Amino acid sequence: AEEEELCSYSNAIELAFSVVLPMVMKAAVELQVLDIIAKAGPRAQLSPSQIASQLPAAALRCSPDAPKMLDRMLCLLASHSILTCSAVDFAALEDKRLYGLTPLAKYFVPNQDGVSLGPLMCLVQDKVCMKSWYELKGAVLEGGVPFMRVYGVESFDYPGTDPRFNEVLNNAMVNYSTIFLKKLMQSSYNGFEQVETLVDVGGGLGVALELITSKYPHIKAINFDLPHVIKHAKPYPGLEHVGGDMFESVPKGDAIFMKGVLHDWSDDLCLKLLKNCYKALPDNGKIIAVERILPEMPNSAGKGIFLMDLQMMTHHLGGRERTQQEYFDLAISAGFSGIRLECLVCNLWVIELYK
Amino acid sequence: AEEEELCSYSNAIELAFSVVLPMVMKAAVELQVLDIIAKAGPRAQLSPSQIASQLPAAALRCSPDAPKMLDRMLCLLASHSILTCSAVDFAALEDKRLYGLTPLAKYFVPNQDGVSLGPLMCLVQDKVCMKSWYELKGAVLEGGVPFMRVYGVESFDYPGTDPRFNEVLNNAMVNYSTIFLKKLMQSSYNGFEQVETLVDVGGGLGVALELITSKYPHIKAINFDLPHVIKHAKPYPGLEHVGGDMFESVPKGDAIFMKGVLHDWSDDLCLKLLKNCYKALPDNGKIIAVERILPEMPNSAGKGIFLMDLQMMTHHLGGRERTQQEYFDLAISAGFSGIRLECLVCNLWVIELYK
């Protein structure tokens, strides 16, 4: 156990300070450092001096050790394969190293459409969401929801009382929706080709149906949402916006689109929503649900699911993530014949529930 | 490029939610969950029901769905090799899996000496220390120190005005010092044998010199500290407690011991301290410095050094970490003949500076 006695200690030390890496990376997103490196052409290598000189420096005289701070941050970022670092065959310390973007880091720089996971980070580490984590110990021992134990009101009503958070929560969701939707539309899924009338549940501004009719103009589309949201709807030909409550009735259509709404509710309201869809659908039936499937047993290949599952229980404990068996049980409880997994797109699964 | 694209997207998604794992590990340590699993003998494999049935509940009865929350937390912890999970050979959901401790997790359970890295993790993620991370962008764009931009006073004076943080910091420092001291005193380093009188700089309560004279009774020990700290010292024969300022004078001795003092100060103050210590030593002597060496390049094998360097940067930015060349330059600036690296003990390097 000679190798264990030091490798395990090193891993424990690296785990003790685990919160430092997400704190620095967020800063490197807010400082627009990844953008400056990528604003000089492909295969770019910029020394810390150039990055510190092209920064949006409101103060003309940034302290002379700012290029040292940037170098110390970029060294940590490069140690985790987020950036590539190389030496200079040449002088100050800033002349020694050059940094460049990894394909991992290019997901945070805005893409051609202008969307990136960057704003999804700021939503996760914002103060309002972060203050919920300190009540987890109390929540486990005494029950309840971590968010309610801090702010009293349910998380579905808080954005109506906080201006600043209502912007971050709307930007992050839009960017994350667009990133997945662009690849979904470019994917090989052909389920939309046979759809005549499609109703989107919780479509917001209608971006999803916008893309749907963008590639398939023959599909007549209605965006179903709450009356509180429809007042922000952007008019667009073909699209029709319908306001109402999901749990009471759903507008009739030949197919139902829904993206990540089953994991925002409990195991009882989901049955009611599925039965409402069952009533709305005609004799022919089809539900196209984009979801995420928990593996039955822990494994190293599923980290990205679990890290987000624990995010949901400490923000709205009514909702939770489910495995394939639970989705099948809910579907057969609603009266549907069964479900089918079509394709994996951006770590999300497209599921067809057939009547 | 699909193989690269999917892997990069999955890794980016895993990186976006990177704070959830350190926020859940802290709650699982504070709840004393790792202790209950290891309080049933080696090769435990205890189900979530039993773990939820032995918690030191603050009320008569915990929430009925507490075992589900504990299971969901332990699944995430087992996905990262911190815990080992195994399916039961067949009932409730909590009956499905059994969890056991990995050698990585045994550093957080209080070992034979009653010390662990749990208090260090609690210190790192405390509110007072975590509020400094949100001013990093302002510090980079405008200079200064993140801690001073939040609390005004220097971090060396704050513990005198907050009783809770003063206790937390002391407990974490005691645990971390004790672990390293116990691991070092069992090692093969024999430099203490030739020392007649040894003076420890910043010895605190004297645990270091306590162990030194515990293994080597012939060594005469002097505990040098500030006058404000010496008052709490426990009387113990063989330890002469001397209060004073490190930057003014040092008591005479044949060897000077210091653990991580150098990285807490700027380059000028370090040179001043080394020059002051140069006067106390006789014509021949030793400086035994326990330090940590930054590699010249950001290799993937040294994360735990860069993480803690960034941690030290945004708390007392007047100090920083140094590489071997910088230590050598400081030593020859103080007038010492040279330095030697003796042994690597628990990711820390023992350095002997000879006159």
Q: Is B95 part of any domain?
A: yes
Domain that holds residue A17: 4-107
Are residues A8 and A136 both part of a single domain?
Answer: no
- Is the same domain home to A148 and A242? no
Q: Cβ–Cβ of A31/B137 closer than 8 Å?
A: yes
| Domain boundary, last residue among A107, A134, A160 | A107
Residues A144 and A42 in one domain: no
Minimum Cα–Cα distance from B69: chain A residue: A140
Which residues of B carry out catalysis?
A: 263, 291, 321
Could you count the other beta carbons within 10 Å of the beta carbon of residue B174? 15
Q: Among the three residues A84, A107, A130, which one is the final residue of a domain in this structure? A: A107
Looking at the partner chain, which of B19, B69, B302 has a beta carbon nearest the beta carbon of A140?
B69
The verdict on A56 and A168 lying in the same domain is no
Residue A181 located in a structural domain:
no
Tell me the nearest-neighbour CA distance from B70 into chain A, angstroms.
8
Instruction: Find out whether A272 and A299 touch, Cβ atoms under 8 Å.
Output: no
Q: Which residue does chain A place closest to B56, by CA atoms?
A: A141
Whether B216 and B92 map to the same domain: the answer is no
Whether residue B127 contacts residue A46, with contact meaning beta carbons closer than 8 Å, is answered with: no
Contact B72 A313 (CB under 8 A): yes
- What element of type H or E holds A150? helix A148-151
Q: Within a domain: residue B267?
A: yes
Beta bridge pairs of residue B98? B86
Q: Which residues of chain A make contact with B140, given a CB cutoff of 8 A? A: 27, 31, 55, 66, 69-70, 73
**Cα–chain-centroid distance for residue B221?**
25
Q: Do B16 and A87 touch (CB under 8 A)?
A: no
Half-sphere exposure in the Cβ direction for A176 (13 Å, CA): 20
> B83-87 and B348-354 as β-strands: parallel, antiparallel, unpaired?
unpaired
Q: Cβ contacts (< 8 Å) between B7 and chain A: which residues?
A: none
Do A344 and A198 have their domain in common? Answer: yes
CB contacts of B136 in chain A (<8 Å) are: 23-24, 27
- Output the six-digit token pair for A276: 């409402």
- Tell me which chain B residues have a C-beta less than 8 angstroms from the C-beta of A13: 117, 304, 308, 347
Q: Residue A178 has which token pair?
A: 């667009």
Tell me the technique behind this structure: cryo-EM
Where chain B is broken, by preceding residue (C–N > 2.5 Å)?
Answer: 90
- Closest CA of chain B from A103, distance in Å: 7
Q: What is the dihedral of CA A39, A44, A45, A49, to 10 degrees?
A: -20
B182 lies in a domain? no
A45 near A91, Cβ under 8 Å? no
The experimental resolution of this structure, in angstroms, equals 3.4
Out of A122, A151, A175, a domain closes at: A175
B151 within some domain: no
Q: Is B296 in contact with A78 (CB distance < 8 Å)?
A: no
Please answer yes or no on whether B22 and A19 come within 8 Å at the CB atom.
yes
Q: CB-CB: which of B17, B63, B307 is closest to A76?
A: B307
The Cα B18–Cα B28 span in angstroms is 17
Same domain, B204 and B77: no
Q: Domain for residue B133, yes or no?
A: no
Q: Is A305 contained in some domain?
A: yes
Integer Cα distance of B201 and B264 in angstroms = 13
* HEC readout, chain B: CHHHHHHHHHHHHHHHCCCHHHHHHHHHHHCCHHHHHCCCCCCCCECHHHHHCCCCCCCCCCCCCHHHHHHHHHHHHHHCCCEEEEECCCCCHHHCEEEEECCCHHHCCCCCCCCCCHHHHHHHCCHHHHCCHHHHHHHHHHCCCHHHHHHCCCCCCHHHHCHHHHHHHHHHHHHHHHHHHHHHHCCCCCHHHHCCEEEEECCCCCHHHHHHHHHCCCCEEEEEECHHHHCCCCCCCCEEEEECCCCCCCCCCCEEEEECCHHHCCHHHHHHHHHHHHHHCCCCCEEEEEECCCCCCCCHHHHHHHHHHHHHHCCCCCCCCCCHHHHHHHHHHHCCCEEEEEEEECCEEEEEEEC
Q: Hey, are the CB atoms on A62 and B143 less than 8 Å from each other?
A: yes
The pairing of beta strand B197-201 with beta strand A287-291: unpaired
Q: Are residues B8 and B98 in the same domain?
A: yes
Q: Helix or strand or coil: residue A270? A: helix
B-interface mutation test, from A8, A9, A36, A122, most B Cβ less than 10 A away:
A9
A350/A231 same-domain check:
yes
CATH at residue B243: 3.40.50.150
Q: Quote the tokens at residue A291.
A: 């979801």
Distance from CA of A242 to the nearest CA of B (A): 33
Judge contact between A352 and A328, C-beta under 8 A. Answer: no
Per-residue burial over A225-245, b if 16 or more Cβ lie within 10 Å, else e, is: beeeebeebeeeeebbbbeee
CB-CB neighbors (< 8 A) of B22 in chain A: 18-19, 22
Number of domains in chain A: 3
SS3 B50: helix
Instruction: Determine how β-strand B83-87 pairs with β-strand A338-345.
Output: unpaired
A268 with A216, same domain: the answer is yes
**Same domain? A205 vs A330:** yes
Dihedrals phi, psi of A138, to nearest 5 degrees: -65, -40
Q: Domain with B48 in it: what CATH number?
A: 1.10.10.10
User: Which residue does chain A place closest to B119, by CA atoms?
Assistant: A16
- Whether residue A199 is found in the same domain as residue A256: yes
Assigned domain for A180 exists: no
State which residue of chain B sits closest to A102, comparing Cα positions: B8
Q: Which two three-digit tokens encode residue B333?
A: 């600036």
Cβ <8 Å between B31 and A137: yes
The helix or strand, by DSSP H or E, that contains position A22, with its residue range, turns out to be helix A20-30
Kindly list the residues from chain A whose CB atom is less than 8 angstroms away from the CB atom of residue B302. 79
